[PDB]
Structures are given as C-alpha cells and as structure tokens.
A paper describes a structure:
Several studies have shown that [name]*02:01+ individuals demonstrate a strong CD8+ T cell response to one such [name]*02:01 restricted CD8+ T cell epitope derived from the Spike (S) protein of [name]-[name]-2, namely, [name]–277 ([name], hereafter referred to as YLQ), which was characterised as an immunodominant epitope. CD8+ T cells recognise the peptide-[name] complex (pHLA) through their T cell receptor ([name]). Here we report the X-ray crystallography structure of a T cell receptor, shared among unrelated individuals (public [name]) in complex with a dominant spike-derived CD8+ T cell epitope (YLQ peptide). We detail the molecular basis for the shared [name] gene usage observed in [name]*02:01+ individuals, providing an understanding of [name] recognition towards a [name]-[name]-2 epitope.
Numbering used by the authors:
A (entry chain C): 1 to 9
B (entry chain A): 1 to 274
C (entry chain B): 0 to 99
C-alpha cells in the first residue's frame, strides 16, 4: 500500500 | 518470524525527448508483489504475486493513482535537483527512493525507512527515530529546511508506523501459504580435481527462502576463510535463492573440511562433509 | 559521476542435466547508472526470447536485474551471457559452467 502523500525535494 | 514491506522507485531523465523512465516495485520480504513501469502499455500498478490479485478494483485504482503521483513527484524532483546542483539539461540523471517498514516476530512496528539517492549517492534519509533528517550536502540541506518547516517527518512517521504495518499484516495473511513459509536450503557438495596436489570443494545451497543465508567452511572444526570463494546470493527465478561457497584444498585431505549452513528454515545449523 | 561496473553470474535455475528443460539465468548486480545491455548466447548467437525482472536496487543504491530464458542443456551446446554498460570498453562475456 503506497504512501497517499508525496513531498517534493 | 520478522517481516518487511519495501517500495523501490527509480526515475531516470531522458534529455533528448519526453518524460523520465519511472519504475516502481513493491516487496513483502524477498517477494515482489506489485510493479509500475512508465514504459509499459497498461499505465496501471500491476500484480506480480497471486496473493495481491485478491485485492479488488478499489485497491488497483488507488495504487495506480498514488504510483502516478509518485512518478510526477520524481519528475519534478529531477528538475529540482538539476537546479540545486547547477547542472545542464544535456545529461541523464537518476533519482532513487526507497521506503518501508520492518516488523518483529510480534508483527508490530520495529523500524521505518524513507530515503533517497541522486546519481547513485546518498541524498536525504529519514533518521531511525523518524523525527530528523540526514542531508548529505547543501542541496540535500535545502530539501531538509523545506521539509522541517512543512513538518514532513511527522506525516511520514504516521504512515511508516501505522498504515505500512497494517497493510504488511494484511498482505502476510493473504499470502500466508508462501509469505509465512520458510524454504530451507537444499544442500549438496561437489569436488573438482584442479592438479594432483589441489582440489576444489563446492558447497551448494539451493531453492531457499528467504534470501538471507550464511555458508562457512571449517578445517578440523576451525573457521577457514583463506583459500575460499563465496558468490553473492542470487535469485533462482522461481522466487527462491541460491548460493555456493568453495574451498581450495590439498588433494587427499577433503575429510578435514566441513561446510556449515545457517538459514531461517533450519531449526539448528546443518553440516556437510565430502 | 559514480559509475559502478556490473557483477555477472550466469547459471541455471535448477541443477543441469542433459535433455531436461531448465532456465538459463544472467544476474547482473552492483551497477550504476541503470542502463545496461544483457544478452544470453547459444553457441555465440543471441537468444531471441529473453525476459528480465523489473529494475530494483540494494541498500547501497546499486542496481540489479535478472535476465532469463527457457533452455534444454546438452553436451555440445555452449551458453553465455553478454553484458555491455557505460563502464565497459567492450561487451563482457561470461560462459555458463554447470558447476557454478
């Protein structure tokens, strides 16, 4: 189950 | 036993034309269960283990949505890092990401990971406490300041400790017939005369699962590393692993040498002799 | 930039016996960047139906791939893996030896 949020470098 | 869930992501820029190559792979222990390839026709998160096929359309639409969001984030990331490093648009660059959770024998959270590499080198990693960051250089430190101000570690910690563990536990249940089964190595020994003074003994470990294994040689009950060759554990292709350890010996002295095999599927270590 | 040469292992999925259907593998690992060319050879000629696992990597970020094809080993037939990568001046050829 993938992380629902992503954070940009 | 103990278990892990891991996701590996590779994004490779292609400056001549188009968006980067993006490959995402999901694992439970040494078993791959999902994949996404930007070059493939489906443009969907695909099953790679029969036990994940039990998941219905909601799952697949959710995983497809998140994997495409992961892909566009990596696309932006490659552009951001090129700017941070003052690189030209001419060269191809790689961003790699790995995240996941480890659970102990109680199937409860043990450890969490969320790290990156840029061009094969460490970029930024979430520290073991899941509260702070390891930024390798001043480019990675720019990411660290942004993420500290935005409280990114708190959001990652919640998924890694909670969500990650809950879904790993579900996968373990649905795939129990394979995921919870340990395959002990099938061992044998081979002999090869090199000259009339020297022989090679090779100790094989085959068809084992998980990949983790220790093969050691002993001479008269004492550990021997000199005159030994140990190949890297390699996949058989059917979900199991292989490994061998060889020792160079004086011809006629084969009996002094014993091979020692340690594996999760073995209650007590096993011994092989020529 | 960090350019890591591939490690190569050529081997069968099951212990080989003449005339018994098997799988010929070529495991490429420890390489960087990810672009790599891998072929399996039958008597020096490129085998056409070769599949590979999806790109993944180890703790140290180095890439690994498994290339494979179904084959029936015989006494005469010689199998090999041919690898090309940015780090290699010429293709690296590793022969299949049933004993390793």
């Amino acid at each position: 189950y993938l992380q629902p949020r992503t954070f940009l470098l | 036993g103990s278990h892990s869930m891991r996701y590996f992501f590779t994004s490779v820029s292609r400056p001549g034309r188009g968006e980067p190559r993006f490959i995402a792979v999901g694992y439970v222990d040494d078993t791959q269960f999902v994949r996404f390839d930007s070059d493939a026709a489906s443009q969907r998160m695909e099953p790679r283990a029969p036990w994940i096929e039990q998941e219905g359309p909601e799952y697949w639409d959710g995983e497809t949505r998140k994997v495409k969001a992961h892909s566009q984030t990596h696309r932006v990331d490659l552009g951001t890092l090129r700017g941070y490093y003052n690189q030209s648009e001419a060269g191809s660059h790689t961003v790699q990401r790995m995240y996941g959770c480890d659970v102990g024998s109680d199937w409860r959270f043990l450890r969490g990971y969320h790290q990156y590499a840029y061009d094969g080198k460490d970029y930024i990693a979430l520290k073991e406490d899941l509260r702070s960051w390891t930024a390798a250089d001043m480019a990675a430190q720019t990411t660290k300041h942004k993420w500290e101000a935005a409280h990114v570690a708190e959001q990652l910690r919640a998924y890694l400790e909670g969500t990650c563990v809950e879904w790993l536990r579900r996968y373990l249940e649905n795939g129990k017939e394979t995921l919870q089964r340990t395959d002990a190595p099938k061992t044998h020994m081979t002999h090869h005369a090199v000259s009339d003074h020297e022989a090679t003994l090779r100790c094989w470990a085959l068809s084992f699962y998980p990949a983790e294994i220790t093969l050691t040689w002993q001479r008269d009950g004492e550990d021997q590393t000199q005159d030994t060759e140990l190949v890297e554990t390699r996949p058989a292709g059917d979900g199991t692993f292989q490994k061998w350890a060889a020792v160079v010996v004086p011809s006629g002295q084969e009996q002094r040498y014993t091979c020692h095999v340690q594996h999760e599927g073995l209650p007590k270590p096993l011994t092989l002799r020529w | 930039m960090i350019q890591r040469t591939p490690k190569i292992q050529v081997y069968s999925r099951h212990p080989a016996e003449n005339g018994k259907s098997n799988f010929l593998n070529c495991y490429v690992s420890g390489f960087h960047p990810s672009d790599i060319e891998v072929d399996l050879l039958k008597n020096g000629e490129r085998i056409e139906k070769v599949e590979h696992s999806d790109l993944s990597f180890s703790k140290d970020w180095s890439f690994y791939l498994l290339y494979y094809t179904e084959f029936t080993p015989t006494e005469k037939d010689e199998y090999a893996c041919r690898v090309n990568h940015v780090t290699l001046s010429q293709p690296k050829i590793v022969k299949w030896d049933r004993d390793m």
